[PDB]
Amino acid sequence: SFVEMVDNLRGKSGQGYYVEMTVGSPPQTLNILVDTGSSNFAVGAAPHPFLHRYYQRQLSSTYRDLRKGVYVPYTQGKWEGELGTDLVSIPHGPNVTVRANIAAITESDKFFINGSNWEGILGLAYAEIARPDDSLEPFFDSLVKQTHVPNLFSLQLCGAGFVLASVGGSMIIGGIDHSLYTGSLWYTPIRREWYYEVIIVRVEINGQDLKMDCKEYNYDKSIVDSGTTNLRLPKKVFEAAVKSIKAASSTEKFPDGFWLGEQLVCWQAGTTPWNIFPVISLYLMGEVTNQSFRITILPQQYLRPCYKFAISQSSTGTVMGAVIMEGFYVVFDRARKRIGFAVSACHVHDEFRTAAVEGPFVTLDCGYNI
Numbered sequence: 001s002f003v004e005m006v007d008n009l010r011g012k013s014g015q016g017y018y019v020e021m022t023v024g025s026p027p028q029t030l031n032i033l034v035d036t037g038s039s040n041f042a043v044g045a046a047p048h049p050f051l052h053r054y055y056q057r058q059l060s061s062t063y064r065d066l067r068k069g070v071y072v073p074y075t076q077g078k079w080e081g082e083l084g085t086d087l088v089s090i091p092h093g094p095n096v097t098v099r100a101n102i103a104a105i106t107e108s109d110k111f112f113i114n115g116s117n118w119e120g121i122l123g124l125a126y127a128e129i130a131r132p133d134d135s136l137e138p139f140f141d142s143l144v145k146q147t148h149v150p151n152l153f154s155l156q157l158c159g160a161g162f163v164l165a166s167v168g169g170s171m172i173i174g175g176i177d178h179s180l181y182t183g184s185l186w187y188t189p190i191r192r193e194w195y196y197e198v199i200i201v202r203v204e205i206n207g208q209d210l211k212m213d214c215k216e217y218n219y220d221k222s223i224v225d226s227g228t229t230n231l232r233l234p235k236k237v238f239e240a241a242v243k244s245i246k247a248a249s250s251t252e253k254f255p256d257g258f259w260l261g262e263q264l265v266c267w268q269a270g271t272t273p274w275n276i277f278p279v280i281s282l283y284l285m286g287e288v289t290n291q292s293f294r295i296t297i298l299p300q301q302y303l304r305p306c307y308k309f310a311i312s313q314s315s316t317g318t319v320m321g322a323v324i325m326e327g328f329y330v331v332f333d334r335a336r337k338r339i340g341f342a343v344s345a346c347h348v349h350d351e352f353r354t355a356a357v358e359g360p361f362v363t364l365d366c367g368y369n370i
């Protein structure tokens with residue numbers, strides 16, 4: 001039953017969402033970040049100043065060494081680990097246990113987050129981007145293969161809403177929980193199975209079309225990534241977006257340090273002039289060629305709590321992260337190579353606007369080949 005997976009996600013604002021998992025025998029309890037933007041099940045497996053718990057392979061009777069190291073450098077930092085398998089469960093997920101690949105993180109740099117309360121990450125993307133290579137079967141692949149769990153999962157990230165603020169959410173594994181969304185689910189095709197890649201065909205700020213060649217929206221790719229807090233946009237699209245948002249909220253302006261996601265902006269006790277900030281609609285390619293649908297997000301989503309501007313620039317394509325997912329119920333339909341969006345039952349909104357998922361919208365080549 002999906003009811004037992006509701007609210008199985010926790011986290012601190014901007015520090016990601018984690019689900020509780022157990023690894024090894026006896027079950028070692030660990031909080032594991034849900035990451036649709038990577039493909040490795042990787043867990044702290046050695047002491048670390050930010051870690052209060054970690055995976056201890058020696059304490060596990062069911063641990064099996066793969067005798068193989070793995071080195072994962074990335075832009076912001078890195079982590080190194082040792083490959084092995086062990087029994088893995090999600091106490092508030094499917095009532096199953098699977099033998100999955102586990103990257104035991106023995107050393108890392110700027111990977112773990114102070115006070116985040118998670119001790120590892122669950123890469124939910126595809127084998128193509130797994131480390132060291134695509135032969136290391138990702139967790140969800142192992143789960144589907146070893147169990148009767150449907151090849152599909154869905155994320156309802158709720159955020160906070162009215163010490164870093166606490167967020168809640170749900171990861172429904174193996175199906176769709178209809179109590180988690182209202183209205184209709186709209187599907188955009190997963191362009192290719194590595195990241196969860198999609199195509200954005202149009203963008204609007206307060207109804208105003210950005211009027212850009214749609215290739216710019218997906219340059220060099222667009223992905224859905226729960227492991228990213230912000231909505232991240234390619235340079236050219238980011239600037240056009242910020243310009244439009246600066247204009248719409250012209251009435252009393254802010255420091256450019258705020259627009260850069262650096263500085264924060266403060267009112268007090270529900271005096272925030274939400275109405276001054278525009279809505280943002282991303283049109284995603286529909287399942288039918290010349291069709292599309294839009295998801296519309298409020299300032300309550302892209303201003304995260306005093307608030308920070310949760311829209312930032314990208315040199316690696318569009319990243320639809322938490323702040324865009326938080327308005328909606330997102331279905332990662334791997335079995336049908338598509339991603340569904342629907343208005344979330346928990347999305348934050350005032351009494352004049354609401355996050356929306358609306359389609360269809362017709363057009364009369366938006367992908368960035370590879």
Ligand SMILES: CN1C(=O)[C@@](c2ccccc2)([C@]23C[C@H]4C[C@H](C[C@H](C4)C2)C3)N=C1N
Nearest residue numbers: 016035037038072074111112121225227228
């Ligand atoms: C964009 N992104 C990352 O940089 C991160 C990552 C980097 C390298 C390997 C695997 C995953 C990361 C995961 C977690 C949360 C956040 C900071 C840090 C730790 C890297 C994103 N996961 C996402 N989606």
